[PDB]
Design a protein around this ligand. Structure first.
Ligand code: ADP
Ligand code: ADP
Ligand code: MG
Ligand code: MG
Lengths: 49, 49, 371, 371
């Protein structure tokens, strides 16, 4: 009788340590995407200097 | 002093400017209530039409 | 009951039921009136052909577009369009089905007043709602924030949206879209000698634009390549069977989107409109907007437009910051798809405009209830 | 020797001879460039129209403002403006006449460096002077003390001056003036269905703003009156012969001066800028500034701005002392009138900036000489 969003939240609560794994996922992918962007431009700044 | 004795309040408190402000705001609420009741009657007449 | 989504677009009307992913009735918004002399007796032939019927018999018809630059010009023609999409294409009674409408930003308000009056008097509905098309395009992407460049058939408009709230002052409008590209393509096909003057020929030039045109990544190099060798030349077969061949007109036509001075407009291109729309916003909410360009509209089907968009914005943007052009493949119907998403929620049920609200508030609650 | 007074404002350059009452040469500061193609060979088709010629032939001219937000951005255009105002309007040699000039508060120093270098290297003068616009407006008001709200075309700045001492910390600047009101008036006219997108149309909307707009004394009562009765609607004739009629846009457009949240600015109105300027002064001299609220600039030409301004300050300030608004009828040219007052003084011979001072101390003696 619940909403399907509530079905998603109760499926989410049935997972051991889900939120830390989501944080692990986003920090790994986001920090990797930042590392792709930052270091060639930093090498370009070093080459300019 | 006559207005202080008229409204049954002691004259040591501000019985001159506060009565003017209270009464001015009450007369503005009188005209505003008249205006909103006229608007309510006119909108009810327009909805009935 | 099951709701309806009817994107009443400037060139094509996309109607269908809520909860669905494909719009059931996609048909162009035209009215075809006969101009020659009938000689058959037997009646049968109407005095006005609407939709695909006007497209099929277009060689003897004057075609009138009711919507011009997101503004409904002839209200009788648009009433005929609404009557055709309610009674013939979708075949639903209007007074038993909720129906979601779409409207372009910065419109004249009396256009919204007249649409509200027709949808509550002529095709009176149990409920309806009028909403901004770029918002529904963002809702199709599954994201809450981002900027939508919606380039339809009459209006190309930029809307940035932060946390589901469209920022009103930063929205800009440009009266340059697919009909003007069709008119410019009609103008430049006379260079090769292919003359097109009738309204029926505009559909042929539009089909040429749909099937063969594409956005150049670098315009000057594509000039040099097309003028150098005949590699980008492509041939098209006409309905009478003549074969034309077009070269640079494949990419001189969409370049009016990035250079509006080709058709005499003083205003800047869509990339500059996007950039100046973003600089009209606050600085702190800029971080969502460059990373969430969600393009929409039928004009954005040209298969070089995402890379050109990314190139022009990354030229314009500060270099420290991510540019991401989310161009979904179904972004033509993203207005309709996002309409089905928004119309298939229990949270939307309190947001409807009932007939009772129309009766107490006139046809003017659409300026208040609908943002 | 007659000096020259030439306010090089953001909106209109106002120039004339010193010792006089009215500026002889008032003309807008635009540089017009043709955007189309010339076909008619001969007859002096000059590539960059300046001033009144750019105003008259504006239908084929992209117009550029050299002064944007009180800052000389384009310098070659400003040199063309100075060349037109010296050689064509006044028709005087610069090398035999002193030239007074004006400047905005809190200006960059290199702006003053560049103006000094142009006024001593290109247009050689015997002497010249740079003054603050508010100081000259206070001088034309005939008072040594007072607070000046000068609202031009780009800058609305508040400057309090006590006994000739212009207080530097209490000066503030709000980037909301007449061009922003014109752009907002372009935005809100599209609700009535009138489109003005080109820079040529900006002069037409500016003329609408100059002729018809007025400051509301109470905004909500004017909303109630405008929504109730169509008595305040006023008609205007366009240069092509069409006639528009505008309603609440006569007073929704100057209300941006009191409510900058219309165009999306977090800062409050000019009244709060004036009041926060007043608390930055000493508590002894606040009483004199309340009775000496001087206005200048043409954005104060709306004929309801004084009573509304007095109402706003009297709401803001304590009512124990007197509030008075100094609004002379000629406060449009009060910058020029104060320059004409200051130029013909016997004391002002020893505060002139000579060419010998320029040669000794670079274009930098204006910083240590003037305030
Ligand atoms: N595959 C395509 N390639 C190029 N242009 C297209 C394509 N499909 C549609 N268009 C253009 O888009 C227009 C329809 O856009 P649409 O999304 O219906 O805008 P609106 O909803 O505002 O009418 C058509 O007139 C056509 O010119
Ligand atoms: N009669 C008027 N009514 C309303 N606004 C005016 C009027 N005259 C001028 N303005 C506005 O005020 C400005 C006047 O320019 P001014 O203040 O003299 O120099 P600037 O604004 O260039 O520093 C113009 O930009 C114009 O938009
Ligand atoms: Mg569309
Ligand atoms: Mg000025």
């Amino acid at each position: 009788k619940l909403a399907s969003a509530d079905h998603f939240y109760l499926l989410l609560l049935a997972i051991p340590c889900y939120q830390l794994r989501i944080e692990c996922m986003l920090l790994c992918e986001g920090a990797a995407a930042v590392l792709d962007m930052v270091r060639p431009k930093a090498q370009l700044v070093l080459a300019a200097c | 002093r006559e207005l202080a004795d008229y409204l049954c309040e002691d004259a040591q408190q501000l019985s001159l400017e506060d009565t003017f402000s209270t009464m001015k705001a009450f007369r503005d609420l009188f005209l505003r209530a008249l205006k909103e009741n006229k608007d309510r009657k006119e909108q009810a007449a327009k909805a009935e039409r | 009951t099951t709701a309806l989504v009817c994107d009443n677009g400037s060139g094509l009307v996309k109607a269908g039921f809520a909860g669905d992913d494909a719009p059931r009735a996609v048909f162009p918004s035209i009215v075809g009136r006969p101009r020659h002399q009938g000689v058959m007796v037997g009646m049968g032939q109407k005095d006005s052909y609407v939709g695909d019927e006007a497209q099929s018999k277009r060689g003897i018809l004057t075609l009138k577009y009711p919507i011009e630059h997101g503004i409904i010009t002839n209200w009788d023609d648009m009433e005929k369009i609404w009557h055709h999409t309610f009674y013939n294409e979708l075949r639903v009674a209007p007074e038993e089905h909720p129906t979601l409408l779409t409207e372009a930003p910065l419109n004249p308000k009396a256009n919204r007043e007249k649409m509200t009056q027709i949808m509550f008097e002529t095709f009176n509905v149990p409920a309806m709602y009028v909403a901004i098309q770029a918002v529904l395009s963002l809702y199709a992407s599954g994201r809450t924030t981002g900027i939508v460049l919606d380039s339809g058939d009459g209006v190309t408009h930029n809307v940035p949206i932060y946390e589901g709230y469209a920022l009103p002052h930063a929205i800009m409008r440009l009266d340059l879209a697919g009909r003007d590209l069709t008119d410019y393509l009609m103008k430049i096909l006379t260079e090769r000698g292919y003359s097109f003057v009738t309204t029926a020929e505009r559909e042929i030039v539009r089909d040429i634009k749909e099937k063969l045109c594409y956005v150049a990544l670098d315009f000057e190099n594509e000039m040099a390549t097309a003028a150098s060798s005949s590699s980008l030349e492509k041939s098209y077969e006409l309905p009478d069977g003549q074969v034309i061949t077009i070269g640079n007109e494949r990419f001189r036509c969409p370049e009016t989107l990035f250079q509006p001075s080709f058709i005499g407009m003083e205003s800047a291109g869509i990339h500059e409109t996007t950039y100046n729309s973003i600089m009209k916003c606050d600085i702190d909410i800029r971080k969502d907007l460059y990373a969430n360009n969600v393009m929409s509209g039928g004009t954005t089907m040209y298969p070089g437009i995402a890379d050109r968009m990314q190139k022009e914005i990354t030229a314009l943007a500060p270099s420290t910051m991510k540019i991401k052009i989310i161009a979904p493949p179904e972004r033509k119907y993203s207005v309709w798809i996002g309409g089905s998403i928004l119309a298939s929620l229990s949270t939307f049920q309190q947001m409807w405009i009932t007939k009772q609200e129309y009766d107490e508030a006139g046809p003017s609650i659409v300026h208040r209830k609908c943002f």
